[PDB]
Amino acid sequence: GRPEWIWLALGTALMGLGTLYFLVKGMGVSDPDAKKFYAITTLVAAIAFTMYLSMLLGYGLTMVPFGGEQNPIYWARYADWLFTTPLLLLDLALLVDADQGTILALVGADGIMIGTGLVGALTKVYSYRFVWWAISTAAMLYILYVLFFGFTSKAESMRPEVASTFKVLRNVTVVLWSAYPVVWLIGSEGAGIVPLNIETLLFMVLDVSAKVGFGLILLRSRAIFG
Ligand SMILES: *C/C=C(C)/C=C/C=C(C)/C=C/C1=C(C)CCCC1(C)C
């Protein structure tokens, strides 16, 4: 019964409830466009629910040696984010009608971000763990640059309702995503300053906010209608 399980149980519950609500509401809408957003967003919550559940049950956890200790690394997180982060970017891209090349470059950068992030979380040479972390953060900053400079401009061709909805989602995304590299840096994966139970609480608040929070804002808006 690890100290962080209570936060994993609360995360499972919140992701589960969000998944159900998104599923029920999406199943009733007939609009084709509205449906796309509902399917993507419900999938994002569903994947998070399953991974929180797996971790709650003892999976996705491995001891990596470094800094003279056996460090508890929850790798199930990257299995979640590998698929949920680019899906969230997809929601945003579809909202502003971004083009093919942009989406591909964004998803590719997102793949690098999660990939190098996991390599770093598994690296046994302490200093190198931060080399990988640095590359992952640079990848994330590219994504945030594109969402802020590129997309916002693209939402210029949209109607107030949609441009308005994108800004809120963009703002929530930029604030939440920018927090992840800091939590990693000071937590179990990096400096080991913040204990795993508190770190798990921090990631749970961020995850739930970035998926269920983002989802509620997105799905209740009129901008999802084609
Ligand atoms: C539902 C999950 C979301 C929206 C997750 C977002 C996760 C990030 C923006 C993660 C970023 C990371 C870095 C910038 C570097 C270190 C490792 C990561 C993967 C924690």
From Swiss-Prot:
Annotated site, Primary proton acceptor, chain positions: 80
Keyword field: Cell membrane, Chromophore, Hydrogen ion transport, Ion transport, Membrane, Photoreceptor protein, Pyrrolidone carboxylic acid, Receptor, Retinal protein, Sensory transduction, Transmembrane, Transmembrane helix, Transport
SUPFAM superfamilies: Family A G protein-coupled receptor-like (SSF81321)
BP terms from Gene Ontology: phototransduction; proton transmembrane transport
Zinc listed as a keyword: no
Cytoplasmic topological domain: 25-38, 92-102, 150-167
Superkingdom, natural source: Archaea
Keyword Transport assigned: yes
Side of membrane Extracellular, spans: 58-74, 123-129, 187-198
Topology with respect to the bilayer: Multi-pass membrane protein
Modification after translation, per record: The covalent binding of retinal to the apoprotein, bacterioopsin, generates bacteriorhodopsin.
Record's subcellular location: Cell membrane
GO cellular component: plasma membrane
One function term, GO molecular function aspect: light-driven active monoatomic ion transmembrane transporter activity
TM segment ranges: 5-24, 39-57, 75-91, 103-122, 130-149, 168-186, 199-218
InterPro entries: Arc/bac/fun_rhodopsins, Rhodopsin_retinal_BS
Modified residues (N6-(retinylidene)lysine): 211
Family the UniProt entry places it in: Belongs to the archaeal/bacterial/fungal opsin family.
Subunit structure, as described in the record: Homotrimer.
Function: Light-driven proton pump.
UniProt-recorded name of the protein: Bacteriorhodopsin
Gene name of the encoded protein: bop
